[PDB]
Amino acid sequence: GGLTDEAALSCCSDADPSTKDFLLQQTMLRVKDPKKSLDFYTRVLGMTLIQKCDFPIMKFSLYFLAYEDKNDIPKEKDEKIAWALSRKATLELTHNWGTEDDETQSYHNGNSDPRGFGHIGIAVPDVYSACKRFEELGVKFVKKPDDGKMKGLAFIQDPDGYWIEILNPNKMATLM
Amino acid sequence: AEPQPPSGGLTDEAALSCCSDADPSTKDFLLQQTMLRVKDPKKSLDFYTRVLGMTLIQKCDFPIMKFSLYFLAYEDKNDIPKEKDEKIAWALSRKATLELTHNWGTEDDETQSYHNGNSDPRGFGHIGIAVPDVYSACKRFEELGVKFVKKPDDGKMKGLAFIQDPDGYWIEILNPNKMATLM
Numbered sequence A: 001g002g003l004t005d006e007a008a009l010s011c012c013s014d015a016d017p018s019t020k021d022f023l024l025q026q027t028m029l030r031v032k033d034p035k036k037s038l039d040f041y042t043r044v045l046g047m048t049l050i051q052k053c054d055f056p057i058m059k060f061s062l063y064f065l066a067y068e069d070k071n072d073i074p075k076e077k078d079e080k081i082a083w084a085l086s087r088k089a090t091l092e093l094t095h096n097w098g099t100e101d102d103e104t105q106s107y108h109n110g111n112s113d114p115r116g117f118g119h120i121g122i123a124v125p126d127v128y129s130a131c132k133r134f135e136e137l138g139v140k141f142v143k144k145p146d147d148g149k150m151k152g153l154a155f156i157q158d159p160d161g162y163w164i165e166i167l168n169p170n171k172m173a174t175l176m
Numbered sequence B: 001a002e003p004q005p006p007s008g009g010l011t012d013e014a015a016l017s018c019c020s021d022a023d024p025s026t027k028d029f030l031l032q033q034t035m036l037r038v039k040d041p042k043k044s045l046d047f048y049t050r051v052l053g054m055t056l057i058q059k060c061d062f063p064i065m066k067f068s069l070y071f072l073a074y075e076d077k078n079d080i081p082k083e084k085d086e087k088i089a090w091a092l093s094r095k096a097t098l099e100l101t102h103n104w105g106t107e108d109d110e111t112q113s114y115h116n117g118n119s120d121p122r123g124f125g126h127i128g129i130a131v132p133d134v135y136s137a138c139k140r141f142e143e144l145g146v147k148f149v150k151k152p153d154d155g156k157m158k159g160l161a162f163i164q165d166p167d168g169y170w171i172e173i174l175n176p177n178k179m180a181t182l183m
Ligand SMILES: N[C@@H](CCC(=O)N[C@@H](CSC(O)OCc1ccc([N+](=O)[O-])cc1)C(=O)NCC(=O)O)C(=O)O
Pocket: A030, A051, A052, A053, A060, A062, A080, A081, A082, A084, A085, A094, A096, B125, B149, B150, B155, B157, B160, B162, B179, B180, B182
């Protein structure tokens, strides 16, 4: 069965002083087509492209997306890099050059075998109004808010089919 | 030239051409979690809290569906509310949390293991933690028996590391104030 609350806590340790100031900075996902992904994360989800890095020899680019005010992005190159990479909760989208031309290529979202990663999740003020707008924009849904068992929780998909949970923190406790 | 050239990297201009300003309806959206399935929650809780210094900020159990959820984050333990409902609203409104999904029974199934996304079929790559000193953090990780994908001075990007958790998910260990002098 599951762990009890006491057992789970016994498995946890206090933060060592050496981990002071550590922060969970990014989640990296590979994207087939950066044009489609950038449109989705900025226009549909409202994130900001805070940094773009290109690696010509290794043939890939990185796009960092985050919920930051665009006016906070530093102008200087090195300051910009340090600022973007010290923001909490960023998405690092990796574009391996040439995948958009390969009709037989697609990335795996982790929700069918083999499974592992499941989804990223965005907290919103109102799951119903967010999803009504997503519907109007033609967003693909795994789960609309009242579909299935948990009412008021949704799962949408990005252009690669990665699942994105849409949740209201103040309604999670009464889910079902 | 005649044939349509292969797609390559986007120019900075091409990338910005696909970006739209944020609609006001999304102004309070936040990136709250990354969900990873874990084979054994005991090993994962020990790793994330003892090795990486994260805090268990919420635990959820779903008896009928036979799974539990463990939320880990870099939060002060004293900020965790006492009441069950207040605790949930607070934990699920924190930015940058990890949601660990334990499907009951995987820990005793010797034929089972999750996939980390870095071998066929690929998708997800890694999570990343920003630290003040990659070399000192990785020296400690080595002392603790942490599995590495890339030590700080391994490969071309010196000063950047990748470690793995109990399920083999990759975790980047980076110092944001030195990333600009990489390459
Ligand atoms: N073919 C690869 C491409 C992605 C890739 O190679 N990423 C590398 C870290 S980049 C990186 O180090 O990031 C460097 C940087 C980022 C952002 C900035 N900035 O803020 O501007 C500046 C510099 C990597 O994973 N190395 C680990 C290993 O396999 O051992 C893939 O995963 O599909």
